[PDB]
């Protein structure tokens, strides 16, 4: 899953550039339009996931390198997460899952499959429990 192995022809480079442009423009514009509340939540997720990534670096890295070794579906990642969040109502596990899914996305070169994963897993992560924490902290 090395970026260079996906950028073999000029068409590959140009198509990457166009897809990046479209996605970057869209994300910048979305943020420009977001309510202050939503922006505050983004900042919290940023700061708290950075703490997980910092404080548990070696743990997170292990989880990444294990996901590398085996092949599995977005579906079953999702279902494995939903099971954990059912009986674990902690804040930490939700933050760690966001960091983990985010890393998985960084390692995925299929943009449609990536957004599908982010979209599904964001539904799973944002249960009543998570919403209560985020609104409490904010």
């Amino acid at each position: 899953t090395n970026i260079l192995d996906y950028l073999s022809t000029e068409r590959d480079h140009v198509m990457m550039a166009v897809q990046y442009y479209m996605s970057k423009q869209r994300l910048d514009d979305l943020y420009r339009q977001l309510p202050t509340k939503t922006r505050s939540y983004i900042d919290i997720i940023n700061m708290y996931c950075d703490k997980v990534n910092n404080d548990y670096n070696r743990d997170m890295n292990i989880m990444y390198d294990m996901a590398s070794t085996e092949s599995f579906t977005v579906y079953d990642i999702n279902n494995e997460v939903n099971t954990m969040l059912l009986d674990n109502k902690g804040l930490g596990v939700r933050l760690a899952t966001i960091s983990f899914i985010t890393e998985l996305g960084k390692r995925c070169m299929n943009p449609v499959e990536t957004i599908k994963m982010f979209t599904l897993l964001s539904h799973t992560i944002c249960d009543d429990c998570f919403i209560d924490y985020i609104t409490d902290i904010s």
């Binding site: 404080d55 954990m84 804040l91 930490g92 760690a96 983990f100």
Partner: peptide, 29 residues
Amino acid sequence: DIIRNIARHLAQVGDSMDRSIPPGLVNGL
């Protein structure tokens, strides 16, 4: 399978981060 192991790992990391926050500062923790 592996997926289960990772998910279990995520909960362990999460719970340890929760326990490192001084009690009371976050409702529900």
